[PDB]
Automatic annotation (TrEMBL), chain B:
Name of the featured protein: Capsid protein
Gene Ontology terms: cellular component: host cell cytoplasm; virion component
Keyword Plastid: no
Acyltransferase keyword on record: no
Coiled-coil segments: none
Keywords: Host cytoplasm, Virion
Originating species: Norwalk virus (Norwalk calicivirus)
Superkingdom of the source species: Viruses
Residue ranges occupied by any Calicivirus coat protein C-terminal domain in the UniProt entry: 83-303
Compartments it resides in: Host cytoplasm; Virion
């Protein structure tokens, strides 16, 4: 078989796969009572992308298309038809939950909506992508973008939303999926929920504290795999010999090993740990693949 | 045996700009008559030695982070920021880089958002400008100025980050003009070298993005020598280069149909046999594949 590998990347060299941001720390938590089912940053270990996951980092939580209308309310809102990169409208019959890169959490996402016309005249206005809105219907090919009172966009010109962070904390829940087709509809083609199946284990996350325009929050976005691991597995396509890869967080200069973890075939990590805490790792260290083990493998407790 | 050199399996719609956070929109070639082409982001040798200000994390391209340390005494709503490493230690100007890694490598009014989060999780963010042409843009000395608008304030000595979005306007915009990383009347140091064709009848080939512009008229073109994914691939692979020039061919893997060929130079840039300034259209499913080690005297099939 083509041997399985992880990329040689320290924590300061990793990116979040659910929001455009550097990884700030590793984190573990029980997430009691919640369903953990992110749709970005989802890949099998042998490189099959899942959910809404795609490879281009600047397309994470970005959508593009053409603005088609200014809405007749007092909220300064603009409807956008979502397109592919070639300008063709999104096809709702594609077996994805939503256009690739669509945000996978409820929030008021602060960002900038920009346009460039064929004659190279441009405009951009900061504002909000409300992923909880009844008119957030990206699987139907349309979303609404907000800005402020005095701002206009051009109808039917190429349009892009660049995400920046959270506008505020209203509606923010990183583990609540949007209704990709709007109210009273079921999401489809989802990457499965993930949970520890072995006793004494918790998920391990790659955490970013993303920007927040106003309010009080740690802004935590937890991904199952950093974007670089998604990219690596996609390129490598190494066969998964068992359901679980044993990985160890290692300092390459001294060989000192900090802890060990289970990297599951479906693309997430578990550790033997209790409670919600940040993990501190050596700045020069990174996970190394050790061996393929079985699901009942007992990890050394952190 | 030596590890074979390879390019990643990535179509043009799967590539990223290495000089600005943006997808690649097209390939582009140009003689760039009379200009010195010397970008500092998106620079790597084929064997994976990063050069200039190049670093691996895509969301850190044209970002700076640190701690705001002063509100400046004019009507311009400008804030001085001490640049830091991720752990909060100040940037060390004696590091043999031109500037902190990921620092912008072109003159512009860059539109973005400056955000803060205090230890007690209280936050604030305000849009505004990073003016890389300003006398106060001195990232190699560990400080830059950030603008916002009236009656917007930041906390002194709290963690701060600038997220770039695009161009604020076109004033001072020149993608091939390097900043003065240490300010007025200083020389830039530790630069990745300028690049140009070495063989007659060739031009550079660029991976081009049209980045956002807040107001004005411009195609917003940012041309990189290597997409960010190729920088990332070479860094991981570290395959030794057998000669100074790799012959690469833009190929559709479904049919084997080859569109054109190019030279991928050891120092990390591409040339093609072409004349004139024009975008290039490629098959959506195609990508460059490494064909063979040639050398600089290899005569390319004309595009």
């Amino acid at each position: 078989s083509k041997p399985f590998t992880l990329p040689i990347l320290t924590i300061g060299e990793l990116s979040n796969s659910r929001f455009p941001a550097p990884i700030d720390e590793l984190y573990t938590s029980p997430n009691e009572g919640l369903v953990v089912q992110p749709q970005n940053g989802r890949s099998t270990l042998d490189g099959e992308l899942l959910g809404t996951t795609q490879l281009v980092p600047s397309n994470i939580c970005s959508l593009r298309g053409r603005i088609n209308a200014h809405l007749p309310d007092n909220q300064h809102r603009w409807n956008m038809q979502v397109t592919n990169a070639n300008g063709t409208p999104f096809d709702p019959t594609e077996d994805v939950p939503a256009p690739l890169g669509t945000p996978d959490f409820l929030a008021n996402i602060y960002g900038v909506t920009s346009q460039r016309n064929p004659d190279n005249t441009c405009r951009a206005h900061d504002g909000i992508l409300a992923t909880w809105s009844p008119k957030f219907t990206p699987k139907l090919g349309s979303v609404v973008l907000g800005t402020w009172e005095d701002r206009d966009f051009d109808i039917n010109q190429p349009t892009r939303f660049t995400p920046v962070g959270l506008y505020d904390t209203d509606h923010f829940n990183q583990w609540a999926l949007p209704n990709y087709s709007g109210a009273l509809t079921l999401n489809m083609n989802l990457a499965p929920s993930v949970a520890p199946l072995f006793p004494g284990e918790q998920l391990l996350f790659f955490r970013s504290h993303i920007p927040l325009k106003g309010g009080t929050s740690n802004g935590a976005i937890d991904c199952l795999l950093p974007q670089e691991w998604v990219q690596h597995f996609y390129q490598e396509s190494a066969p998964s010999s068992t359901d679980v890869a044993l990985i160890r967080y290692t300092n390459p200069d001294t060989g000192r090993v900090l802890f060990e973890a289970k990297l599951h075939r479906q693309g997430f990590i578990t550790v033997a740990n209790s409670g919600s805490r940040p993990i501190v790792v050596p700045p020069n260290g990174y996970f190394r693949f050790d061996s393929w083990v079985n699901q009942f493998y007992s990890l050394a407790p952190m």
